[PDB]
Structures are given as C-alpha cells and as structure tokens.
Amino acid sequence: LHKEPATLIKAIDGDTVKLMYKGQPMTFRLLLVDTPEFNEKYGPEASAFTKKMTENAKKIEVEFDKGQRTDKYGRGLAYIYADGKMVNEALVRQGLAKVAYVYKGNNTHEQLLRKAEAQAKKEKLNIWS
Numbered sequence: 434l435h436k437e438p439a440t441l442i443k444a445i446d447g448d449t450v451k452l453m454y455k456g457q458p459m460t461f462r463l464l465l466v467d468t469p470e471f472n473e474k475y476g477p478e479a480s481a482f483t484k485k486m487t488e489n490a491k492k493i494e495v496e497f498d499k500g501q502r503t504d505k506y507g508r509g510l511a512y513i514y515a516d517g518k519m520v521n522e523a524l525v526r527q528g529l530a531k532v533a534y535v536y537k538g539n540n541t542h543e544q545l546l547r548k549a550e551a552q553a554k555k556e557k558l559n560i561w562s
C-alpha cells in the first residue's frame with residue numbers, strides 16, 4: 434500500500450471527510466470503521482475527533498487498499514493519515530469507532546484495527562463504557 438497526497442477540503446463526520454485528491458474534490462469514507470451518526474451517542478465526539486485530526490494536520494495522505502477504491506455512493510475508500518497518524522486506527526483506539534465493513538481484498542489493516550478495538554474495549558472507552 435502507498436500513501437498519496439491530498440488536502441483537506443472539509444471535515445464531514447466521524448468516518449467521512451471531503452478531500453482534494455489528484456486535484457478533484459472527493460468524499461472519502463474511512464475503510465474498516467463505523468462511527469456513530471451525529472444524531473447518535475458518541476456521534477458528535479467522533480465528528481469532533483476526526484475534524485480536529487484532519488484540520489490540525491499539516492499533511493493529509495490517502496492510502497487505498499488492494500480492492501475497490503470507490504463505493505456505490507462514489508465515496509473514495511481509503512485509510513486517511515494525518516501527519517503520519519492513521520485516523521481509522523485512532524478512532525477505533527479511542528472507542529469512537531467500531532471495526533466494521535470488513536470486505537475481503539480491502540482489509541490490509543484489519544488486524545491492526547482489531548488490536549486497537551481490543552485495547553479500547555479493555556479501557557471501556559467511549560462506545561465501550
């Protein structure tokens with residue numbers, strides 16, 4: 434897997450962000466996670482968490498997995514990095530996301546994220562409290 438440049442256009446919610454990728458605006462959905470919706474418990478905290486992460490990054494990187502790169506809504510599917518920290522992993526680690534939507538061929542960081550979830554669960558963080 435390769436890291437590719439992109440710039441923040443706009444924070445959206447816990448697991449979607451609007452980025453400019455190869456010069457085009459695109460909504461990206463974070464692979465392998467599910468944040469609660471804004472209208473649900475920990476929804477605002479997940480949105481805030483991702484927002485802060487992407488807005489404070491001097492460098493945003495997009496990492497496609499081996500499989501599908503856009504979903505049926507035309508959202509990009511990627512691992513998103515903020516100054517080298519993976520947002521996907523960070524949300525899970527803090528119990529603001531569950532590991533989810535694990536489809537074969539788009540699951541490289543699956544284990545990493547389950548490990549993060551296991552530790553978030555252990556600590557009864559946020560969604561696990």
Ligand SMILES: Cc1cn([C@H]2C[C@H](OP(=O)(O)O)[C@@H](COP(=O)(O)O)O2)c(=O)[nH]c1=O
Nearest residue numbers: 462463464465466467504505510534536539
């Ligand atoms: C994360 C992810 C979501 N999706 C689709 C599946 C879900 O379909 P449905 O909308 O039909 O439920 C939806 C979940 O995204 P949201 O959690 O952003 O709603 O987006 C994928 O197709 N591939 C993926 O890797």
Ligand SMILES: [Ca+2]
Nearest residue numbers: 448467468469
């Ligand atoms: Ca969601």
